[PDB]
Amino acid sequence: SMTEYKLVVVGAGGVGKSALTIQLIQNHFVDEYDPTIEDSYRKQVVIDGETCLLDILDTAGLEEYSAMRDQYMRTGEGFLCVFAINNTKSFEDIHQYREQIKRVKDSDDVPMVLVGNKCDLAARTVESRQAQDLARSYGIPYIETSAKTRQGVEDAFYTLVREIRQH
Amino acid sequence: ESLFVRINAAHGFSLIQVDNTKVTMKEILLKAVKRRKGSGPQYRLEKQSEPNVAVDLDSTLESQSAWEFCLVRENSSR
Numbered sequence A: 001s002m003t004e005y006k007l008v009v010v011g012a013g014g015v016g017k018s019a020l021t022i023q024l025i026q027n028h029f030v031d032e033y034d035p036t037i038e039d040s041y042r043k044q045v046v047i048d049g050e051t052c053l054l055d056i057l058d059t060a061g062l063e064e065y066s067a068m069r070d071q072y073m074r075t076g077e078g079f080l081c082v083f084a085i086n087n088t089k090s091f092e093d094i095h096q097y098r099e100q101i102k103r104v105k106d107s108d109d110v111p112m113v114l115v116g117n118k119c120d121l122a123a124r125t126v127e128s129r130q131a132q133d134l135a136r137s138y139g140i141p142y143i144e145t146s147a148k149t150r151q152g153v154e155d156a157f158y159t160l161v162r163e164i165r166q167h
Numbered sequence B: 001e002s003l004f005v006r007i008n009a010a011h012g013f014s015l016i017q018v019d020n021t022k023v024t025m026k027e028i029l030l031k032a033v034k035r036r037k038g039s040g041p042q043y044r045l046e047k048q049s050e051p052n053v054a055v056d057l058d059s060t061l062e063s064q065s066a067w068e069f070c071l072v073r074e075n076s077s078r
């Protein structure tokens, strides 16, 4: 009945895409690592006083499933591009996701948020200023999250919905 | 790419990795429930092409001749 938003969570293996999604959907932290092939979760939420349906697609970071990107990139209406603050390679990998979204959408115009996850951990190897500068180079917001503490989780997903609403 | 089955549930779908087709339907159900529901409501699996019939959870994936199933609460319908 209501408006549905197809949000897609992308990023390298192990950065916490599934944990972020389950913390949003079920208010629960998944401690174990079970690598994703693909999973979707639908939930009714209120954002800025307006009810809507989130359809969140949790995608594979493992390169063996990279062929599926084309499909979900075409129909995704907003993207969380997730890296982990203790994993510099996951930060380097962000650009590859953006470029594939460009090949199938013919632009990067799509709403996107750069998400630096695992900010509850003490040891960081991606500098905050480096992530802020990357997001600025893309013209998108940067949000620091922890799927463990729920810090920033609603802000990350709700920012996408706000950006879609304001097109 | 590993083999996997598609499980359609009340609030989305899950792709469940399987090592081979000798896995039982019970194992697949348990994995699908744990991921989508977490930690007693009971569930069945149905072949996509055969609504309202529970698959035998003791049978193998290979015996189903199907790669897509619906996860349904036992007191409900797809």
Ligand SMILES: Nc1nc2c(ncn2[C@@H]2O[C@H](COP(=O)(O)OP(=O)(O)NP(=O)(O)O)[C@@H](O)[C@H]2O)c(=O)[nH]1
Binding pocket: A011, A012, A013, A014, A015, A016, A017, A018, A019, A020, A030, A031, A032, A033, A034, A035, A036, A037, A059, A060, A061, A062, A117, A118, A119, A120, A121, A145, A146, A147, A148, A149
């Ligand atoms: N401390 C901490 N651990 C986290 C956080 N998010 C995820 N993790 C942990 O990191 C591991 C990988 O998380 P998961 O969400 O499965 O990663 P993924 O990005 O979905 N991996 P894949 O692409 O293979 O599906 C898990 O052990 C999970 O508990 C976080 O914010 N903080």
Ligand SMILES: [Mg+2]
Binding pocket: A017, A018, A019, A034, A035, A036, A058, A059
């Ligand atoms: Mg995952």
